Structure 1
């Protein structure tokens, strides 16, 4: 019958839950345009700092059989650029836009949010605040909530135990404006060593870098589901290890409303969204689901 990947959240309609993960294929105008032109339900701009950053020396990203490792160092065009893209360029008629923000301090986030406010108001761009200790997180969210008169989401690093799921959820649940939680950012500071070259594969930080892709899917599912459970009032956006509609299906089963695609998108480019939508639809059709609502968060436990 009639299947739909439509997602409705944040006062928006998304054609499908897919979007790039922040930082992937979303740094330049060209990329943002490509993402916007893609079949993705949405996009998020590269996490921005107040000013442009060159980011780290290359190689700073490496695709791997099981994912990716990167230490990009937040190369980005700077907030004004993404603000301007959101304010003046982005075609919201095509899809909603998220703007990822990653100030290097609370003050930077506060100042960016102060300015993002009007554009969020005028254009509907949605903040994904990159949060990737808990007191600091609470302070950050307080400071941002103080100056930012809109719902926003937060991009979380993965956590690895319930104590942390609980503590993080507790924080986030303090902030009604935090309407979505994106789980997860990279698994931090993995170290890929190329057995052939007997070396690391990225240059910054002695080769340590965030892992994405296949490596991170169960972690991502865990986090998605953990926050899905602990933040019942909030939306969870999944991010981590999505290469296929089936992976996305897992994200949604774990609780994801939107499903972000990082490494796989980096490796395939924006055409991946046509394939993901089609695959997820295929998965849904095989499983006799018509909407994401029908199985979102419905992963069955055995206990």
Structure 2
């Protein structure tokens, strides 16, 4: 009953891994292909292979997680060859998602041009919100820079493209962003990336828990659900219907999934919870969501999608 239509493709269910979790190597990706996930996405890549930030750079917290990975990835070519090889073997229904996070506008355009030139027929996600690279601010918090990049990208990119956005906290920002985004033939927006630059402390040791950037890292998990839902909902009511939404943030039970769909998300990505539980999470959460739908007498996501009621 979780059949979903997104970017003109049909998926068995709306669940995916969030970029960066369980998708670094071909082995990780194969494990995702073998799981019950409806679709999957690669780790955000750069032109060059990156080792990332020094350890420890990820810590499981009682209410979520904190990380400052620093974009460790095997390089753009590694991921491109893998998705191209995978396209030939039609052993999967639905396109694969490819995430890119260039350190500069130039690097992003270069990767997008290569994707445009290749035979890749999947979906591309442009990450405009990595908050863990020292000296690099989040592009998506600079509205003018974001619009300029997108204008240039759409002068040549014709394949499906979505953007991974950082969370916004003021309604006017949603208004400004929606207006910038609505002028482009974007396939989707994915809200949200981790809440940037939080801090977690070990009181006994009187120190931070991660090595990079003096302990400042992205926050994910239960801590961010209220912000994640707000972002999905705020964009759902402002974006032209042609642009769909992927909801990411604080999803760990079928109920969390239900809340994102009610707000208007079409596909759902699981980060922190997947990192803690492994690919078996997809099996569990699908059962939990179906159970919720059964109790309410819903037979398809279209029955309640985007139908959040106001008081």
Give, in whole Å, the separation in 2 of the partners of 1:232 and 1:244: 29
Conservation of the 8 A alpha-carbon contact between 2:121 and 2:159: no
Conservation of the 8 A alpha-carbon contact between 1:98 and 1:128: yes
Q: TM-score, length-normalised on structure 2?
A: 0.92
* 1:197–1:140 Cα change, 3 Å: same
Query: Are 1:301 and 2:310 counterparts?
Result: yes
Measure how far apart 1:195 and its partner are. Answer: 2.1
Measure how far apart 1:191 and its partner are. Answer: 0.3
1:248-267: CA deviation from partner (whole Å, max 9, x where unpaired): 11111111100000000011
- Name 1:216's counterpart in structure 2: 224
1:242-281: CA deviation from partner (whole Å, max 9, x where unpaired): 0011101111111110000000001111111111111111
Give, in whole Å, the separation in 2 of the partners of 1:59 and 1:279: 34
Measure how far apart 1:27 and its partner are. Answer: 1.0
Measure how far apart 1:50 and its partner are. Answer: 1.0
Measure how far apart 1:123 and its partner are. Answer: 4.2
Q: Per the alignment, in what secondary structure is the counterpart of residue 40 of structure 1?
A: coil
Give, in whole Å, the separation in 1 of the partners of 2:252 and 2:22: 15
Give, in whole Å, the separation in 2 of the partners of 1:258 and 1:186: 17
Which runs of 5 or more structure 1 residues have no equivalent in the other structure? none
- Which protein is richer in strand relative to its size? 1
Query: Are 1:46 and 2:43 counterparts?
Result: yes
- Name 1:245's counterpart in structure 2: 254
- Name 1:160's counterpart in structure 2: 169
- Name 2:178's counterpart in structure 1: 169
- Name 1:261's counterpart in structure 2: 270
Query: Are 1:202 and 2:201 counterparts?
Result: no
Conservation of the 8 A alpha-carbon contact between 1:17 and 1:258: yes
Q: Per the alignment, in what secondary structure is the counterpart of residue 20 of structure 2?
A: coil
Measure how far apart 1:192 and its partner are. Answer: 0.7
The aligned length equals 296
- Name 1:21's counterpart in structure 2: 18
Q: Per the alignment, in what secondary structure is the counterpart of residue 237 of structure 2?
A: helix
Q: TM-score, length-normalised on structure 1?
A: 0.95
